[PDB]
Design a binder for these strands. Sequence first.
RNA 1: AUUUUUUGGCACCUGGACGGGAAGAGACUUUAAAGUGAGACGUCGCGACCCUCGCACUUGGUCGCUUGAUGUUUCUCUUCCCGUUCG
Lengths: 170, 107, 86, 83, 74, 91, 108, 80, 104, 70
Amino acid sequence: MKFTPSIVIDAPQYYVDHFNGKYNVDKCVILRDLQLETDSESMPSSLKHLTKPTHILDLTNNDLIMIPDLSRRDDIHTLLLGRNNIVEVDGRLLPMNVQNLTLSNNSIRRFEDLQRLRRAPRTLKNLTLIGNQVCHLANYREHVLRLVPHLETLDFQNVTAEERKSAMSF
Amino acid sequence: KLVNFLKKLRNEQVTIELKNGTTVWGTLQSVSPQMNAILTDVKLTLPQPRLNKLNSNGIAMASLYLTGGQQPTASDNIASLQYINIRGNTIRQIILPDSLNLDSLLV
Amino acid sequence: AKNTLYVSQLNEKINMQRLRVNLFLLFATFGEVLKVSMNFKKQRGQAFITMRTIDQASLAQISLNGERFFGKPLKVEFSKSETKTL
Amino acid sequence: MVPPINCIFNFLQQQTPVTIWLFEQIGIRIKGKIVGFDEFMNVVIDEAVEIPVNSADGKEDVEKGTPLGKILLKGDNITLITS
Amino acid sequence: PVNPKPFLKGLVNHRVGVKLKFNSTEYRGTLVSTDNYFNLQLNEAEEFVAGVSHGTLGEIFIRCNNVLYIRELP
Amino acid sequence: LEELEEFEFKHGPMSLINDAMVTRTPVIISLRNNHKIIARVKAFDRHCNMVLENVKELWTEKKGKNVINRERFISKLFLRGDSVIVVLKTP
Amino acid sequence: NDEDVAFEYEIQKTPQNILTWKRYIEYWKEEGRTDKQIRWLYERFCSQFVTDTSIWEDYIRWESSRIFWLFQRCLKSDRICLSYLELAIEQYDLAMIRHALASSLMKM
Amino acid sequence: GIPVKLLNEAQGHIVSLELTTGATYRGKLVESEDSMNVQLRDVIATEPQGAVTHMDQIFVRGSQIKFIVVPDLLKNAPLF
Amino acid sequence: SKIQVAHSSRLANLIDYKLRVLTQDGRVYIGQLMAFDKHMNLVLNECIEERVPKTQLDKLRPRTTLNIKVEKRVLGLTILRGEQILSTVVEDKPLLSKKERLVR
Amino acid sequence: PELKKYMDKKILLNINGSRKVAGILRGYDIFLNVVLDDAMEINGEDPANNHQLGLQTVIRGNSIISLEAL
RNA sequence: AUUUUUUGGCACCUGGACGGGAAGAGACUUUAAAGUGAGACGUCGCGACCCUCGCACUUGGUCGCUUGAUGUUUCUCUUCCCGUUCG
């Protein structure tokens, strides 16, 4: 498939509670296993139909080659992109207030593919990069940290004070 | 009496001015017996100098922003809403259409 | 087996708000996580994850079991029941 | 039990001098005697004087009070009436 | 005794000072009429803010809720 | 019921507003936000709601330590009566 | 602007999905494309579905003199002609009001 | 209508209410009235600035209530 | 993009719609409208309050490039008193419960 | 006001203007007017700053914010 | 339109830009040498020691934040490396 208005309008919208424990408050929009390939002459104009407010956008297992241009979104605090074919992480394209970003099992291969993560918003608290080729490289974690030292969690392991104090020294 | 005049202004463009100075341009859709207005395709605005006097206007600016419609960064804090319901006690003035034949509505 | 996985051997030292959010983010990769439920006053170190489908729950069981999560290796198995407060 | 209206009728009938506290004007009080009232608690006060008052440590320098004469004080402005 | 409304109906055609609860304004004028809701009509009115006159107004109608007190003026 | 309304608008204080309406003369309404309105009364009710014509609205606004007058002309207007401080008969 | 093409490819996916055409029209209303443009899109919306009158009745609900002209076409091509009876009566030229109505009674 | 009746259904539970002053009170709702007057018992009071204090019993006038927070169980009430 | 509601939607139609309710002290309460009253007393389920801090209020002045970081309180089932409501705005329609996602 | 449980007990009221009055409840009203005996204006911990009010004291009900037992 | 909701105690008061942080100034305490625009509420957390072995429908105590950020009351600015955006 590729992005079209009905796909973005019909998408299941339901409140979840995973960020609150008690109350269902985050609208989760589901676009999973849908095999949307990206096309700049079809996708961003379709995403103008993505309902507002929305809080979790779940684009897991889709054929996107880069993080979707959601830069115009103040509301999507969680963006899920697991198993997609993302190759480059342009922090401009993230939502303005994204807190959690999940890049698990993408196709990122070098720190040069990560280098524009530096541009990500200072609101970004959580990053997952598990299963990328980049996770095998030497000093990978210290590299991601000095690119974006304000992470609280990277690959589901807490960023200790000594990791942060190291990363900010560069 | 005259709320039953306002009840006739349905589907007509009004600029309601609120007690706090916010101006609500929009199509009037309803007026309750207690002057609760309902308007659609609304544009909330705060007059230019009021944005400089935050001791008086901080609450007005905060309520305008928190409508969630102030995605525009236009000066005078325009916010656009597809629908609003205004509690009648908050109305200061209603600026009416110029073409309204008042006599036919009042009589 | 069932929609609901049981997750055990969580890192006791971590704040549950982080732990529940990161369990959502961890399991969402391999399934539509409809509910993460945890209640350490009654069941320390444990969470019940309800997926949309058995195929997603089974793929998660096959892939997250033993994976490191806040340093401690995670235990995953199918739950005995559904979550009722889903 | 005395209903409040009966207590104000006691101030009226005995002509008891009262101090009245004003609703939001914490800095002013009215002293006088009530010569009539109504179900809204409007009061006609005779010999009324407005007294400057401090906001906290609330001393009342009656020596600088200003005599109003007889006034109808609208009841939505009363907060307390006391001997 | 004199109840509020009989009293105010007694001040008609006499000069009164209506002090408002706002702006420190007091209107001094001849009371022409009053409502059961204690609205007031004054004639020959003078606006005073804090005791400084803003000059003669002519006729004014004063909404009841603005009034702090009405005092007769000797 | 309504006979009392026709009494109060004829003898009572609102007879001023009524006279201004019938003689079509403009009134200087003074509002709770210190705006003046100079206007013709077209209709009113017991709450002092009004329908007004040829409204001129007047007020001061401040820049720094000095004040500049501002003005609007509005062709037709409705005024909610709770905001009225005073209504003055224009001579 | 680009956004129309996102609906055009969707029409190429499944053209008999009426809700696609409806959302496309809705976007053209919200932006405010000209009457002569929206006419072309409504005529496409009819032509892809020329076997059913209901979409013509939605078109007439937007075209509402051209709505009378197309209504004369739709009467020439019967529940919509029944819906036309109040408009047709006001024409007063009795052959033009009565012939379509008796045709609708003939195909009742 | 329903909103006051819901405040009758909350009797016996720990309500939390904020006044127009910004003061907060939390305690057992032992009485409530159609005006939204309330009586709280065993009350954690809190000045607008956050200075906590504690009280045995309090009556609150309806006019001064900004909002009242009610137990979640009552979202199951038959009123709705 | 944003939700559109039919123009005839009175407050009685907006039950189970998630409102933003705007109040006389410059704060907003967000929650599904469960019930209302002649006064506009409202019952809001799973209610959350937002306010604009005095540190952020300056960012509302003239120069979507502004990004206000509001402060929020999760309240839960809440009764708003009518006197406090200035205005109400529709934020969202009744969503499907996530239960309904469950395939079996 | 089903306020009878406070009758003849001492109470402390917070009333409009952040003012406080304490006294003995001797009666109440539909509008929640109240009558206090032995009334005192409270504004601090120091008994020299608190002022004994008159023998009888009527509080107009719309002024009362809360009425706290003692 | 008259105390408890809706007919008002409300109103006076080249270049630009943001953000990493460094150096000085400042201010207060020490005896030339060492510390960092005032005083105080609260709250999110973070990270260590102290509670529990696990399949349900508020883990508990305690200490540092010498900042990890944040909201709120009361009193009296120059300069250099540099990240990122704008026309």
